[PDB]
Amino acid sequence: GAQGGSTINYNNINYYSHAASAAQNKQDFTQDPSKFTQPIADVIKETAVPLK
Amino acid sequence: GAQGGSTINYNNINYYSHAASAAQNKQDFTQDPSKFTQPIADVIKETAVPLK
Amino acid sequence: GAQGGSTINYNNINYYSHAASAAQNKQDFTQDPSKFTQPIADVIKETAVPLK
Amino acid sequence: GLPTKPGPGSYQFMTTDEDCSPCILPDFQPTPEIFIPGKVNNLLEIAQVESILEANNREGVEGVERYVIPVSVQDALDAQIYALRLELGGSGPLSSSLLGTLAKHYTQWSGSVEITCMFTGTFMTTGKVLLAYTPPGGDMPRNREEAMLGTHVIWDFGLQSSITLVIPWISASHFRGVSNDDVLNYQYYAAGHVTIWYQTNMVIPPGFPNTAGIIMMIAAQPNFSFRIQKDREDMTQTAILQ
Amino acid sequence: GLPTKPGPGSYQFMTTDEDCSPCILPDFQPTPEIFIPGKVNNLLEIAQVESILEANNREGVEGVERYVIPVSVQDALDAQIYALRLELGGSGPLSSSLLGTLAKHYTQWSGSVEITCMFTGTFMTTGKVLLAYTPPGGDMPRNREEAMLGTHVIWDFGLQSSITLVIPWISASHFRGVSNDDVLNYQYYAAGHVTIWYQTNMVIPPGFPNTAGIIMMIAAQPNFSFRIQKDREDMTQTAILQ
Amino acid sequence: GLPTKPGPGSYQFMTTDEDCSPCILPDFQPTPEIFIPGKVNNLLEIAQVESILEANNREGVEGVERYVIPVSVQDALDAQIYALRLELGGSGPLSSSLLGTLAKHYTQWSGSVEITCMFTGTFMTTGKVLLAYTPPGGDMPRNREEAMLGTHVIWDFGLQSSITLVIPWISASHFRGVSNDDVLNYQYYAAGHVTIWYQTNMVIPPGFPNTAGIIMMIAAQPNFSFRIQKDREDMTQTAILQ
Amino acid sequence: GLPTKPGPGSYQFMTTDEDCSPCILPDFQPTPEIFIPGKVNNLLEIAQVESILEANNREGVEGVERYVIPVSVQDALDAQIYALRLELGGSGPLSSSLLGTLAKHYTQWSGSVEITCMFTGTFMTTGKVLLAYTPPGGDMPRNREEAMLGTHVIWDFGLQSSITLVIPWISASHFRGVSNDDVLNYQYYAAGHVTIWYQTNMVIPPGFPNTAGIIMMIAAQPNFSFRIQKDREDMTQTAILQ
Amino acid sequence: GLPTKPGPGSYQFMTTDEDCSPCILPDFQPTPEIFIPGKVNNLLEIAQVESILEANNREGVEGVERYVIPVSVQDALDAQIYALRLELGGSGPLSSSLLGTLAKHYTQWSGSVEITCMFTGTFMTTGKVLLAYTPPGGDMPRNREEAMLGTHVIWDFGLQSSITLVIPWISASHFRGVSNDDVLNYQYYAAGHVTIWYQTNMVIPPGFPNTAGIIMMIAAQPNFSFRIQKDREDMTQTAILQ
Amino acid sequence: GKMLKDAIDKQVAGALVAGTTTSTHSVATDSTPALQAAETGATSTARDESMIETRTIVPTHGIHETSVESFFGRSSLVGMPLLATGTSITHWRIDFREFVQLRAKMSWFTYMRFDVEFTIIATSSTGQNVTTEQHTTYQVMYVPPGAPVPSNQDSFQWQSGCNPSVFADTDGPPAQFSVPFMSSANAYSTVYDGYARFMDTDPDRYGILPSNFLGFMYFRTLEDAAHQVRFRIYAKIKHTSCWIPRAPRQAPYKKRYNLVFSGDSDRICSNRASLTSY
Amino acid sequence: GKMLKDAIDKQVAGALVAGTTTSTHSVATDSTPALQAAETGATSTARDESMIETRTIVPTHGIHETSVESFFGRSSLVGMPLLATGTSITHWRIDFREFVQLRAKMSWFTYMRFDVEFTIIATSSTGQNVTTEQHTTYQVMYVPPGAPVPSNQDSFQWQSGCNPSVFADTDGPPAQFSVPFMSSANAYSTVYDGYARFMDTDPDRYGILPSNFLGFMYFRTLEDAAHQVRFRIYAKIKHTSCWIPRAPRQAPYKKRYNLVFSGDSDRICSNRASLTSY
């Protein structure tokens, strides 16, 4: 991308018929860390005491 | 096609003059299974008795 | 040029940065033969006598 | 010239390539396409056509007779007529049918299958038959009491000569393996059992033939498909044909 | 550089390639095109021009005389004048004509052909002739009774010196094979028979020439075409020409 | 043909190439994607999950016990509980954690780290603990007086069982080297010290266990990242697996 | 990578290629173009400039004297002054002129040529001269009676010192061959004859020089061109120059 | 595949190529660019900075003293202080300066140069100096009478310690050659002479230092440029560095 | 541009398999979907939903790997002529019947209209058939019926003024070329119930349809070979129309130009000892 | 054109790391961010700004080198079959378990859906394993489960009418090809807590999920090899979906088809003599 900073901007051009032929995907996809870090029924806000 | 599910979507680009040079056709064409499965003058609907 | 007669018509496409990389120029440039054939202060028309 | 970088895979020949290539006869103009009946666009149109199971595969039965399962007057109740492991691969009776021979060209399959049975006894010959499909996990059902717990149809011999047992696609996964490759444990894909039982008995008037036949037929339902072409096992050669 | 993958067929030379290629004299400016009479754009313009059949191909006839079929005063009724297997290939009389020599360069043909006959007897010489075309399936017609059952014209000698028998394209397929290649059974493409018969007789005044001639001529109709270029059989060399 | 100039790097295979390449099965149609819980799009979602430090790495401690730092009733004031060089590389206790094992695959790191400690003594067991982070330049702090001069938290044992010491990204540069490669002097990237001290003492009722434990846990903060993939040191093989 | 098929002519070097090619100094910025008098864009600007024929090519004449054709007082009527085969190739007098030396670099030529003659006798010296151009087909004209039948000018010596005989492009074809290549029969392109005759006589006052000179000059007309570059015959070397 | 014709120069590596090439780490995200003082975009910003001439290059002078030209009380009139051949190449005093060391990397130069001189005598020390630039064609000026005929400045020692002699670009051509390559006769590019003379004398109070110094400094003007990178002569090695 | 739009065909494989609708129990004398009659020649019409209680299933599976194009659209070996060093010449008769895998795949249909991509791999070896080095051009000449065949390596037939030829290197990339549908007929025929000739019923001309036969490929090296060359000829069938499906070949093939089979043991699937156990 | 727009996907890596807000001192009984409870199973919520006084930091660092695509998106060795000269045939069973680096990278997840780019480098050598010259075509044939395997170099199975093959030269550029996600399942499984078969609990079928196994690659030279050939098979995983992260492998791998480990000394990190000094 002739460079913004940490932004790689790519035009993936597949020359073949099957999508599997395309090169690797460069998108950043959504991160939901809280399904692993906060996997609890009741949210615990940072400023609260956790138990009770 | 950078992927919908089971849809392969291809732009066949022939570089030569004769159509025979083109790569293989990826269209799905119409299926008429009933010219082989129901090859009978009188249609028999599924819920009816076949004979008489 | 898929042919007009004696007209060669070319699109010179240079792939490199420096103009010196380009292929040879196919333009016909102006001809001024008279700077060499008639290099004289006073024009002498064809039908006149040259001296005097 | 345009600067390029040929990469890996240069000059290889892959048999499944989809590339244009120069025509050795670029001025040729073929004969027109005429109408012909029965144009096929997809081999699953063939797989939906019923064909006869080579069902009477008992050692010693040869020829056309392998196509008729015996059905007799029974002297005991709830007897078994037939047993068949549901398999598109291998070498059992389904393997030589239209669907089975197409499955020989493919590695994976999905969808419902139907089995149509036609009774061939005399007009006066009566009977009722239980056709069962048992999903996998265990063995072939041992008695009609166990087989009836599965998917099953009950067939009354009469004017309408034939019955369908639809073997529905019942499966942990979207696809199964066609083959039973042992080293690769493709028995993982065991697809269950088909068994046939006397629901009442075959009954005849005095002095009639005490034996008749079922002609079993099989085909794919419209929800069926195949993946991964593969070489047919039993179409071989030891020499170039001359 | 642009990433590329050269594939199979790289660096091959095919004689029928249709590709642009660098000009070794890119500044050259050719002489103008002038008008010349008789410009040809398609060799089927030549094939529609009549040429003379080397029809009198009997063993012992040499030179110009091979171009005149004898026609005589008959002493018997319904006699045969000529017989010819309809073939663009091989080495019979049609093979050396304009149409036949073009067919030597091609593998397949389709369309109607016409044969124009010119009588060369004296003004006072009369006659009627039957020209027959027999579609394939059997042999050459044996008598005028059998030949007349086919396509045929009946020719009266008179002021208009010439006649046309149009041999129409009558064929199971859209195209036939030019050649009669035996190993390949191209006799499959047998195209029928042309025969000539006396419809009445040639009659002369006393002491006239009792023998005259037909000059046979052949050409393609406008519905005719050729496919698949092929090498001419009889244009050979054993050494480079010096 | 289009004139080209293949350049340097032609026909090379680079393992990090991002190029399209012909599919050996161009007609294949994969099974749909179904919902599965816990989809991961980025390995820093794993690095933000707490894992247990193999913190009790004293010679002779084996198994699960390496996960519990001893904490005892002290007979002297201001004693030290624990000492740990802040390092994502090497082979010390951080190296076997989730964050440490991810760091084994990367060359460089940036961001804040947090350490969560859980006390495991009886309900009746009390104590106060000082957790210190010392930025680099010198050695491990020798006494609690020196350690307190740094970033530090003071932990009171109580109903809320656990504490966090956030080790903030304090650094001359935007990134540090994961490894401590000696020949390359990667000790340049020394990242400081973590030490644990008795702030008061562990106090027990008569006849209770005089020893309890801290389970240390570590994870990355949301401002953390890794660069430059590299091979994992301790995942080796001497032979192909059979 | 983009699938490609390198074809025939790959990696060849043709000396007349018109292709772009990478610059070994892509940041260089040349000195500006300044005005210089006498810029030439096309070598036919040079060919239209008159130059002196090495016309007095008689065996034994050396140096500057080869540029002056003798003209004398005649003692007989209608005598011949000069004879010259019209040829841009070969090695006769036209071959060393500006037009002739350009023709050495080319294979084919077309257009009109002019020959300008300048008399160098004394002011008091009189004469009339016939300059003839004979189109090809025969030999050089033998007498002034035969030469006058062609294109010709008649020159009167006087104040205007010079005359032009325009040799017009008279030719069966649009172009001729420059060379007289024998094996290839390029004498096919014979372009005719130029001859000079005394129309009256050279007359002098008593005791004047009885011999004077013509300086012949030649150039191309504006309708002239050259095709097909070719190597110059007489610009050779047996060794690399040091 | 797209038909192509790789041409000459295929697979060559030119060190000045300007081509894109695959990145071995295509997912890497570098550290941000921070502000740093003194960013340089073009090495002619360095060439316009004054640097000290190694001007006192007399045999036997070592070290820092090579940077101070002696200036003394004279006992004779119009004496010479200094002489210097104007040359960016070679090995004389200009060659080791900032401008001279940049010129070592380049083949050609154009533009005006300035020389700034700083007097270092005591406050009480007076003098007047003539600084001359002589365009090429002859030798170094022999006396102050000859040198004054050129471009010159006259310097009065005083509060403003320094003077500039601007050596203007005076040249037949737009560019000169940096080097003095003998085999190639690059003395063609001789650029003239710089000389320094006593315009009056250096005068001192009784018992002061009778010798003081000039520190010569040189830089390029804003109209200056370099072409054609070339290897630096005096930056060599006989072995790989370890 | 629109002119370049002519050379591009957007073509889509997105046909799905049939889905499933939920159904409930049926107790009636009205609708009897399970009763059939195979005598009509129609295949059963009964579906899943009418035989058991089904759930709903959204269709997700494609059918494209069994489209006739995909089934035939790959390369297969069809000819393996060996060029010896004695004459440096060989040929291959052009048909897809020497090698059984492609022939058996074609036996599912009666008439087939297609184009062909041919691919030729040349391999040099010693007399003991071990790979060896040999760089040489070879020539493949299409010789159609009625064109004179080359008899030697230096025959002037290899001029090739009218026969198309391909020249390639033994140790270069494989030669590859396409071919349109060339039959005089409007399709090719996989099977022929007739005679090659009128006035002839010789068994050797039964089942021979000469409109399937477009002639010969002839092979020489451009110099005399130092080692034997094996050409492997691959064909990929493309742009395919198919009519009239058949019972596919089950017995092994025995001859190139007819359907003769052994038929000693009339069975295809394997045997068991009892129909009521596996 | 829009049709060519279909073959281009603009895709962007511009996700940044979290920044830092300035904070000030806090003296209260209201907000206690440092008090945690690890018993819940939640990771600590405390951040920098709530524990010390922070400055403001604008985020500048990307995260893309740890995206699952980037982490798996490079080629790794997965198979090294050796073709000897005695039979000139070899094969490789297709799975990513012979070589430990890719296997250990995959062990961070349970289920993985991806495509594959395969790259094959062939190298010829002598019996003493020194590089040597040998120019020959080789054939890699995909043999799926149930297709008959070639038994020799000249077996007619190499016809390849239905198995896909790649032909390339030993001394040419590397063969390379892509593969879609081929499992009958909706993802691959890195670990399997079950049996390969019903009615069987043999230890050798524990942990064996046969839906990960898509068959074999078979390798011959097109002539009989003069020297042994080593094929190196590289796989790059692409278009990657990952679910359910795991504790990554820590003990060395020992067997190809199960997780057996030594476990003699229960520790991973190195030891020291005292917890209060380094």
Ligand SMILES: CCCCCCCCCCCCCC(=O)O
């Ligand atoms: C042969 C058709 C040429 C089309 C290729 C154009 C160049 C590829 C696009 C690359 C896009 C991302 C590059 C970048 O900005 O970093």
Ligand SMILES: CCCCCCCCCCCCCC(=O)O
């Ligand atoms: C040299 C001209 C470049 C034109 C080729 C552009 C790429 C080919 C189009 C491929 C279209 C189908 C790809 C896909 O979406 O799966």
Ligand SMILES: CCCCCCCCCCCCCC(=O)O
């Ligand atoms: C890779 C980009 C393709 C662009 C090249 C298009 C063809 C070159 C243009 C040639 C123009 C002059 C040709 C002619 O008309 O004689």
Ligand SMILES: CCCCCCCCCCCCCC(=O)O
């Ligand atoms: C070499 C260029 C022209 C060659 C023409 C090849 C066309 C082959 C089609 C074969 C169709 C019939 C197949 C068969 O008879 O079994």
Ligand SMILES: CCCCCCCCCCCCCC(=O)O
């Ligand atoms: C050669 C073309 C078809 C080959 C298919 C290769 C697909 C490989 C996927 C492997 C996924 C399972 C990995 C494992 O079991 O460890």
